[PDB]
Symmetry: D2
Subunit: 380 residues, 4 copies
């Protein structure tokens, strides 16, 4: 029996790698994906072999991530509950996609992940795992093992030679999320020094910095006149936005599984892209199209947040969003200053910006007012 494990190299997945060998007497194949966590994925691939993996795979998926997940999601103008740019949500479908692919190539009947038994992550991983390969078997140790506490896990780890090292994290090219610990009290401001991807706004440059982003077809293709591949482009905007402390969010969100959770997110590059995209759309999109699109975005956002990426509903809405996005061509000019992003200019080859006279307006008014007058008259 073989099992493909989503291995990140941490303590837990290392413990899980041992547990799987022991518990299922199976051969474990480790898979580590580089999606911009800023760690040396090769060190994880090696540590997996040291921990007992019968094979360790490590792939650079940054380009695929941005191009096939982040970009399509951004085209939809997806925002969860007013602020969340969904950094963790769009990433999971990618990992799971590869776990299933690898499992098929290696002839493995099962895949495994170390997402906890009470969070949303497990749902995200498995929803796409089941959607891509319906008969795959999933093993989620956090739902099957008996461990009573951390102390016992630490002890278990020491027993197996696994090296043991105030809040949880998750980082990738789109963002870094923080929760748990000091963050669990929604009335307590995040601690000083927690942020890693972005500079403290109070420590940001005293001079604002301008940046231009070009869109060709719904997708950003250049920064300050330099053409850049999808991953390279997000990276660049993370640097520029990060240096200024842009893209910070502090919310209490509604979980799909549990109840409410307090999360802090920094999405410098994506935050810039969000306003840059809308800046171009303000010249290129038709009014009614824009209004309909924005009324569908929230639905799309929750689908991504819940984990229904490879679900027919999300793909259906995507056809709509992509159709609209095809018109988004032009350049956005923004001004970055101490935590804030300001749209300062926009232009487009097919801008709709600058057919009737005043008498025309009077007629429009009269026709629009008719049902209101009748109603008023009827209220007698």
């Amino acid at each position: 029996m073989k099992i493909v494990l989503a291995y990140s190299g941490g303590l837990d997945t290392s413990i899980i790698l041992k547990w799987l060998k022991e518990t299922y007497r199976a051969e474990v194949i480790a898979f580590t994906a580089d999606i911009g966590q800023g760690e040396e994925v090769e060190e994880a691939r090696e540590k997996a072999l040291r921990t007992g993996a019968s094979k360790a795979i490590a792939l650079d998926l940054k380009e695929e991530f941005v191009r096939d997940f982040v970009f399509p999601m951004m085209r939809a103008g997806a925002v969860y509950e007013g602020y969340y740019l969904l950094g963790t949500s769009i990433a999971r479908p990618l990992i799971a996609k590869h776990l299933v692919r690898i499992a098929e190539e290696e002839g493995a009947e099962a895949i495994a992940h170390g997402a906890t038994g009470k969070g949303n992550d497990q749902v995200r991983f498995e929803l796409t795992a089941y959607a891509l390969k319906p008969d795959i078997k999933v093993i989620a140790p956090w739902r099957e093992w008996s461990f009573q506490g951390r102390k016992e896990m630490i002890a278990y780890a020491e027993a197996h030679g696994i090296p043991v090292p105030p809040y949880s994290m998750d980082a990738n090219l789109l963002h870094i999320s923080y929760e748990g610990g000091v963050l669990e009290d929604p009335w307590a401001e995040p601690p000083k020094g927690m942020f890693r991807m972005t500079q403290d706004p109070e420590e940001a440059p005293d001079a604002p910095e301008y940046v231009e982003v070009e869109f060709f077809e719904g997708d950003p293709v250049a920064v300050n006149g330099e053409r850049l591949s999808p991953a390279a482009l997000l990276q660049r905007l993370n640097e520029i936005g990060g240096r200024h402390g842009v893209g910070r969010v502090d919310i209490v969100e509604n979980r799909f599984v549990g109840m409410k959770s307090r999360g802090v997110y920094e999405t410098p590059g994506g935050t810039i892209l969000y306003h840059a995209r809308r800046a171009v759309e303000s010249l290129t999109l038709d009014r009614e199209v824009l209004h309909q699109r924005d009324m569908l975005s929230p639905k799309y956002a929750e689908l991504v947040y819940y984990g229904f990426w490879y679900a027919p509903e999300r793909e259906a809405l995507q056809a709509y969003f992509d159709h609209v996005a095809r018109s988004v061509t032009g350049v956005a000019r923004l001004k970055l200053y101490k935590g804030n992003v300001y749209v300062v200019g926009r232009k487009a080859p097919k801008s709709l910006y600058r057919g009737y006279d005043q008498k025309d307006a009077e007629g429009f008014i009269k026709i629009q007012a008719l049902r209101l007058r009748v109603r008023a008259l009827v209220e007698r």
Copy 2:
């Protein structure tokens, strides 16, 4: 014949006042509303009499503006095309509401306003005017007169004893908008020193300021523990927020009448209230209710923008938003710093947040059921 005129005290409405008397051989009743334009409405009232009004009325409508228009709108989480807080839109229905009220009391058959014959304000004024009094007669001079140029209008003013004088503005308790002139080039950043209501972020305090806003029932009732009336509260948050340069928006918006226009808006108090409200809702509102509410907010925003305030659709939605907003009770703690507003804390008496009802096995069952239709889809695609 009597005509009630929405008189602002400026050159154009003064010219309009003279124009109306002669053109219609009628007497004009001037009405000036104080909605926070930062002007002495009483001097406009006197100037009207001097300009020929048979009667001039000036009312302080700041409290009503915030209590009956701004708050109801904010409860709905209304935002037009991603950023516009509707500062100009919610103020028009209120002005027209009084014009029609005064016309009825004075026995006037018509009302008049000085909105341009080609813009959006005209629609706002008239849609509410007709909705409140179907038989009212509306006279929009800009759509009716023969003036062919600005210069001709000045000569007319000078001939009638009416005193004469980069972009145009509109200010009230919620915001100040800027449009036209140099702002007409969507690629050009607004000129230095244009903002009046908010300090430039570059000149804002080096020290961040924390502010707490209490919501009792969907509406903000206190700032930093101090109970404030609707207008006094909006005012207070404009002062606090303005000092930090909070609430600046630069957008090209879609108009109801013509095409697009580049507008710049500064809404310090409203911006703080926007995030504060959502902060309290994050603990008080149910997930499914929040999601449904946010999907209707845009529709509501466009109704307000287009001018359908006293319209049955807006009121039906308002019934929904008010039902939801009733649960928004609690306090939001925000941090202000150089142009930005950061939510740093929130609490509530009936918070649904328990940082802690089901076990791991439960989650697996949930996954299986949620995944069924997807698995069936996959097998069918073979």
Copy 3:
């Protein structure tokens, strides 16, 4: 330990009554609700006492059913996936509501029901049970026991001496649903003679019958001039409509649990009420209000279908629907003829219809409206250059 069982009186709930006693060795308070199944609930009550129940309650909830559940739902124009009028969905919440109330009075820690693990009902009972009393315990025998088939159950019943006997059904004041058995083949038409509430159109009167329904405030208050209570009014319309074979639906629906299911429903009075209301709304509701209401109807419908009646979302939407429904005051006239319902007329005290804007604006006005509405399209074409 005490368990309150939603007891209907059939073989399954009877077996469950025995099973609960042997399995949990607790007292079982049986509860049978009269919601219009055309069944004598006292029989079930007594049959429950015989079967072992330590106590049996039988309540007449017809008026409550129609008044506090069917009516509010109808005000919203609720229709699931094009044709389902939610006959079974709005009933469950009512029952669950009483199960929890009873358990609270009897000091019972749990409630039980005989809905299967494959359906929506289990969700409806439980979602409302937990929403009304979070600490309640729910026992669903179909999900816990070992019976591997009909046969095993029949024997088990006889072992405990319990009376024993194509498709199964569910009936109440709103409709009768048929499902399973021969109905599982979506290509196969329901067998002839299956329907019970409606007469076969082929046997319906040769002369059309006209019926008038008065709505006062979003709810129907009279039929053909006779004022009738909510439950009484639904009954009358079932008789009138059933006679003509009105309201038959045959659909493959999507269950909340994940799979498709072939269902057949007959909702005579509801189908008449459905059209009667829209007919009155056509004169009393503003255009924009109507268009918004119709786009929200489907969401409300799935909420009810899934079991989220006592959920904040449904109640939030209800405030909107009730607000709009408040204006639905007037009368609808419909013609019933062999399975069909045709709206032939409608009137209302505050109708917005004036046969004069057809027989506050002129020709010139329309021209202007057209120019303003066309501007963005012309600019689009121009820019497409």
Copy 4:
């Protein structure tokens, strides 16, 4: 100057043709489109010459109408205010399209139509024209002339020699609408003998008739096993459904321009197609996709009703609906009987229906977990209400 007129062949457009000559002294190019009005369009074309047209064009547009307008609209499940299948609405865009095309080829400066100045049709004609040719000039005689009353127009007509004579009609392959006259009172039942496309339920066959419709990719492609082109298929279904009195609607609808209006519609083929399509969708469409599609249908419907066919919003929605419709492949079996259409069966090569999941991999215990997770927020809510 040249003016391309949407000439229907009737009294009004005949008067208009004269009015255009006499008022604008323009060369009038008449255009009649056969979209299935059941009128020998060629007659109209000759009559236009007899009336003064310097050129008369008649085109058979049945196929284009169904394939490029009716089908795309049905693909979206478009229903205006619960009952209107938009028979008149989807036709206008097609006509205006040709009006504009003929104007360019003929080098004509303006186009004209005879929709009244009080209705929605004028909007439909013009939104389309302006959408395809922004520089086009439009002449709407009803909004420009001094005529007041049919008595007066009949005089002008007689004067010029144009032949002269309870409700107004409008027919095409999709339906026939009736409005005005004795129909204006919302409380009055329509008059016996009005309907033309459908047999009266009471006079319909005594035995029910079954019909099957196959959909391949969102569109109907065959009836009772016979492949049929878009126009021929609608025709066949009008014949079959008509004989049984199917597809009659009687509503008071909300107008875009006027206030409210009482309309009666008969759409036999369309009504069958509507229930057939949903029958095939019940097996081929995913639950969440269906629920989402149905919530958007009403918006698409008012877009069509208001005349925004060639508008960016409608085409954007169309992309959503076409994406969804692509999966609708299968056959629906319907029972026609005295005015009604009953769905009695449906099958599909890629049906998502699995009997094994409903009959007695799916594990009953999974439902409990599903239930508990779904119930959490409700329990917390109750507990907090304490």
